[PDB]
């Protein structure tokens, strides 16, 4: 045949892959964590959005830290040989590097380590996407008026917010990040490379949202999401 290029991940395996959505709304009272109003809107939007991208979606609700770890372990031990990619969405309370089970925290590292190039061989060389709607701390953005590969390769973290910052969720509409992400995937997944879709998401969250609160501390605040890419190729959800 003629000249070939390999600048993009192979996304024409028989299956696009799994999309695991962990939707933590209700937390054990002893943790002192609030109910996450609006997160069901997020979970439903994600399910439909990734369904239409032809992902095998599994929704899980209100998982303990133990259940999250066993779920991730089990999923990483499935045979993904006929799958192009893997997607995990985490909707919960969080801190920097941490997501909450209903009864306490899980290190994100513990979750993502299961999918290392050396620990999940049927996903080696394939994009592994972690989409995280959770706080990464307590900072508020006041805004301004205008032969081997690394085991850590081929991960992408789409964080809802910058390191150290709160992340915003609307109880009626869903989280700023997830609602923007689904919108941009709906509009552009048949048109743009994934980093460029996520960049549109950054702009949408940055420009169209601002918090409203009776509490001065929490009023008129802004958010920028944070794309963290260890990918080695371009990612298009479609194929020729």
């Amino acid at each position: 045949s003629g000249i070939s290029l390999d600048n993009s991940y192979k996304m024409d395996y028989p299956e696009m892959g799994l999309c695991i959505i962990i939707n933590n709304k209700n937390f054990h009272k002893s943790t002192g964590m609030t109910s996450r109003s609006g997160t069901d809107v997020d979970a439903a939007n994600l399910r439909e959005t990734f369904r239409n991208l032809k992902y095998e979606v599994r929704n899980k609700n209100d998982l303990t830290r133990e259940e999250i770890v066993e779920l991730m372990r089990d999923v990483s031990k499935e045979d993904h040989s006929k799958r192009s990619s893997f997607v995990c969405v985490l909707l919960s309370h969080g801190e920097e590097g941490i997501i909450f089970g209903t009864n306490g925290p899980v290190d994100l590292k513990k979750i993502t380590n299961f999918f290392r190039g050396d620990r999940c061989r049927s996903l080696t060389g394939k994009p592994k996407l972690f989409i995280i709607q959770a706080c990464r701390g307590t900072e508020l953005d006041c805004g301004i008026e205008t032969h081997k590969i690394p085991v850590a390769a081929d991960f992408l973290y789409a964080y809802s917010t910058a390191p150290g910052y709160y992340s915003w969720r609307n109880s009626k509409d869903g989280s700023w990040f997830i609602q923007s992400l689904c919108a941009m995937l709906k509009q552009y997944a048949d048109k743009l490379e994934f980093m460029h879709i996520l960049t549109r998401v950054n702009r949408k969250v940055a420009t169209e949202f601002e918090s409203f609160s009776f509490d001065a501390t929490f009023h008129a605040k802004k958010q920028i999401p944070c794309i963290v890419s260890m990918l080695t190729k371009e990612l298009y959800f479609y194929h020729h």
Partner: peptide, 4 residues
């Protein structure tokens, strides 16, 4: 609006 609420924080996570």
């Amino acid at each position: 609006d609420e924080v996570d």
